[PDB]
């Protein structure tokens, strides 16, 4: 109580200082309070530049999280050198996560607070929500017994979707399969290696048969779909000293991936030798829930979670010399701490078209689109 009050004051005072220092650290900071908090954020891949205008239009997939109100899947537009909701689609319960299919960015899968995983083609619904408040997904993907968060599309196999669930399983669907009644597709495969809540799943970005999963059992598992046994992964890695909440494959380094954990660390892994962690990124003060590699720079990654402050890392600086005073602030590979949020970060996304732009969303309804200044990452 007293202790809670002190933390709240520290957070607020730090935010006031952060605010006054933004010109030194950013080239852009746009803050926007959403009607409802979003648990999810992902930039869509396409940008629209208007004739004779000094800005381009980028788009984001967002969701709502309501108390006792109708939820929606949202497409928002963002003008980059205003934020508007363009498309609003009825969704059953909060949108735990929403991700577009690489081969057709009109297609979006969502995780719900139920066992169903949903698919929408957003161009095949009205831009304004149906007044009935009824959710009408284009597909219902069944196979789980519980809700979950992890979701991953195979960028080399059209329509191959993986999903992680609190039921301890991973479901795979090919959404091109012929649906039965109620537009249902049953899981093509179910992977049962984990012994606890599965938090995240991710396809390898080059090898179409490989994927990884992470769970509350503290394991990272590497799976190969060419194997007949779905109860035993190709590799089981003792990854962390607490729950593993996220993983991300490096788009430019085919052997490298990262995992983020309740143990406050991001671990770096080399698929050629998973017996030994390659590196441990330390600095976060609380549980990490999301980790994403930069779409533009192979050494750059970011992580976020309960400590409210997204960290950006540059693994090119691992082992570099720094003053002992600098060491007090963190390891050499810590590049940036984003101080813009005062609540837990629920998700974030790197802009795929404008380097160094990130959108992050937090539990207090805030969405921020921001770009660190060149003086941070250059030299």
């Amino acid at each position: 109580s007293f202790d809670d009050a002190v933390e709240e004051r520290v957070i607020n005072e730090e935010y006031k200082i952060w605010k006054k220092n933004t010109p030194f650290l950013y080239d852009l900071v746009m803050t926007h309070a959403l009607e409802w908090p979003s648990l999810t954020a992902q930039w869509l891949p396409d940008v629209t530049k208007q004739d004779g205008k000094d800005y381009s239009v980028h788009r984001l997939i967002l969701g709502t999280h309501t108390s006792d109100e109708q939820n929606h899947l949202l497409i928002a537009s963002v003008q980059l050198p205003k934020i508007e909701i363009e498309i609003k689609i009825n969704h059953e319960g909060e949108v735990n996560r929403a991700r577009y299919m690489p081969q057709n960015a009109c297609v979006i899968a969502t995780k719900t607070p139920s066992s169903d995983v949903l698919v929408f083609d957003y161009t095949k619904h009205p831009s304004k929500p149906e007044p009935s408040g009824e959710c009408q997904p284009d597909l219902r993907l069944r196979g789980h017994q519980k809700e979950g968060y992890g979701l991953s599309w195979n960028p080399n196999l059209n329509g191959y979707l993986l999903s992680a669930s609190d039921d301890h399983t991973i479901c795979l669907w090919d959404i091109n399969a012929t649906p039965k009644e109620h537009r249902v597709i049953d899981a093509k495969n179910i992977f049962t290696g984990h012994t606890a809540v599965v938090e995240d799943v991710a396809w390898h970005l080059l090898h179409e048969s490989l994927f990884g999963s992470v769970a509350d059992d503290q394991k990272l598992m590497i799976w190969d779909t060419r194997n007949n046994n779905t109860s035993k992964p190709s590799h089981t890695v003792d990854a962390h000293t607490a729950e593993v909440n996220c993983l991300s494959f490096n788009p430019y380094s085919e052997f490298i991936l990262a995992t983020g954990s309740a143990d406050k660390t991001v671990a770096l892994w080399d698929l050629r030798n998973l017996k030994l962690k390659l590196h441990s990124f330390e600095s976060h003060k609380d549980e990490i829930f999301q980790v994403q590699w930069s779409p533009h720079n192979e050494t750059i990654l970011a992580s976020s979670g309960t400590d409210r402050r997204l960290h950006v890392w540059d693994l090119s600086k691992i082992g570099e010399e720094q003053s002992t005073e600098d060491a007090e602030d963190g390891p050499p590979e810590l590049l940036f701490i984003h101080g813009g949020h005062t609540a837990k970060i629920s998700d974030f996304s790197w802009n795929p078209n404008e380097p160094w732009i990130i959108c992050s969303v937090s539990e207090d309804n805030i969405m921020q689109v921001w770009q660190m200044a060149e003086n941070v990452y250059n030299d």
């Binding site: 730090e14 200082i17 952060w18 220092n21 933004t22 030194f24 650290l25 402050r309 600098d326 602030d329 963190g330 810590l334 590049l335 940036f336 701490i337 984003h338 101080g339 660190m372 200044a373 003086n375 941070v376 030299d379």
Partner: peptide
């Protein structure tokens, strides 16, 4: 200075 900025960056703007 570039170093001052990187320090401020690593300290989260505080």
């Amino acid at each position: 200075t570039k170093p001052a900025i990187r320090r401020l960056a690593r300290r989260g703007g505080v």
